[PDB]
Design a protein around this ligand. Structure first.
Ligand SMILES: [Zn+2]
Ligand SMILES: [Zn+2]
Length: 92
């Protein structure tokens, strides 16, 4: 049992746990794979920072536990490569 996430990375940075089937792994534009659920909180809500005008963040760039900064969300949660997970179970 395990996941072949080695292709892109392995486990999610936010939780630091292997990518399980229900983990729904996703690759960010910063080149960091993480659990989709973990990726949710990654984006800001009702808040912004370093915004020249209007509003910054939330639907656009996402904060990553690695770089904690993004320019665009073109490669953000949406380009899920696949589920390298397989035969994953709590029991042995
Ligand atoms: Zn995670
Ligand atoms: Zn990152």
């Amino acid at each position: 049992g395990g996941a072949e996430a080695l292709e892109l990375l392995e486990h999610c940075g936010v939780c630091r746990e292997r990518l399980r089937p229900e983990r729904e792994p996703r690759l960010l534009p910063c080149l960091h794979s993480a659990c989709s659920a973990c990726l949710g909180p990654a984006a800001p809500a009702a808040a912004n920072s370093s915004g020249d005008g209007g509003a910054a963040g939330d639907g656009t760039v996402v904060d990553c536990p690695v770089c904690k900064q993004q320019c665009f969300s073109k490669d953000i949660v949406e380009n899920y490569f696949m589920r390298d997970s397989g035969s994953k179970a709590a029991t042995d």
